[PDB]
């Protein structure tokens, strides 16, 4: 439904002429991380071990926590998201993944790292929309969530950062933006 403005988000996600694709993906990814943990932060009271014993995205989707050949762990939504956000932040702080020093290149596998981060962030939106949209409304933050999400989706679509399959829990919503 509602968005914060009448700005053209499709154009705003586009790689500027002469810009470095890796740098562009990196700056935008940090932005989305920040947004999503702000947004989740506002409903964190309503997301409990009681309300959300699994990391759900409607009845068809149940995410299990994993990073190593490690066996994925079935866990509550607050836990899953805690683990996720800590993990993402740690990547963002890693100089070998996200170099800070001017002139220093991104690693060989950078695209893979970004994609991994972004597909995980997506899961947080999915949980919020399916399970906590009541709280969102209550807080009158539907315009804020919707705009953030719309932006996110356009970005990941533009740069082929998340597979259609991965977006499936929100396909209807995404199509409406289509």
């Amino acid at each position: 439904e509602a968005t914060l403005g009448s700005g053209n988000l499709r154009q705003a996600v586009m790689l500027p002429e002469g810009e470095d694709l890796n740098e562009w993906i990196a700056v935008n990814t940090v932005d989305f991380f920040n947004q999503i943990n702000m947004l989740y932060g506002t409903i964190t009271e309503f997301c409990t071990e009681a309300s959300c014993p699994v990391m759900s995205a409607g009845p068809r989707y149940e995410y299990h926590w994993a990073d190593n050949i490690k066996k994925p762990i079935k866990c509550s939504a607050p836990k899953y998201i805690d683990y996720l956000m800590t993990w993402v932040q740690d990547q963002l702080d890693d100089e070998t993944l996200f170099p800070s020093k001017i002139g220093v290149p991104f690693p060989k596998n950078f695209m893979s790292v970004a994609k991994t981060i972004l597909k995980r962030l997506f899961r947080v939106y999915a949980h919020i929309y399916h399970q906590h949209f009541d709280s969102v409304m209550q807080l009158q933050e539907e315009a804020h969530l919707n705009t953030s999400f719309k932006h996110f989706i356009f970005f990941v679509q533009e740069f082929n950062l998340i597979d259609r399959r991965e977006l499936a829990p929100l396909q209807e919503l995404i199509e409406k933006l289509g």
Binding site: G5, G18, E23, T42, E141, H144
Partner: protein
Amino acid sequence: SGHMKLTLENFYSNLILQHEERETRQKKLEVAMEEEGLADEEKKLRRSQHARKETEFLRLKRTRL
């Protein structure tokens, strides 16, 4: 949450305006280059120089956080 709301509102307003401005800067650059009468190879060099500044800016923008 009021911080979230203000911060996102500001972000989206800025996001659009910055995008528009960036486009206009690119155009202005092209015009200036014709006006000055830069040869093709010179224009390439100039574009690249300017692009470097923009990408350095993006890095710092992330980095300073």
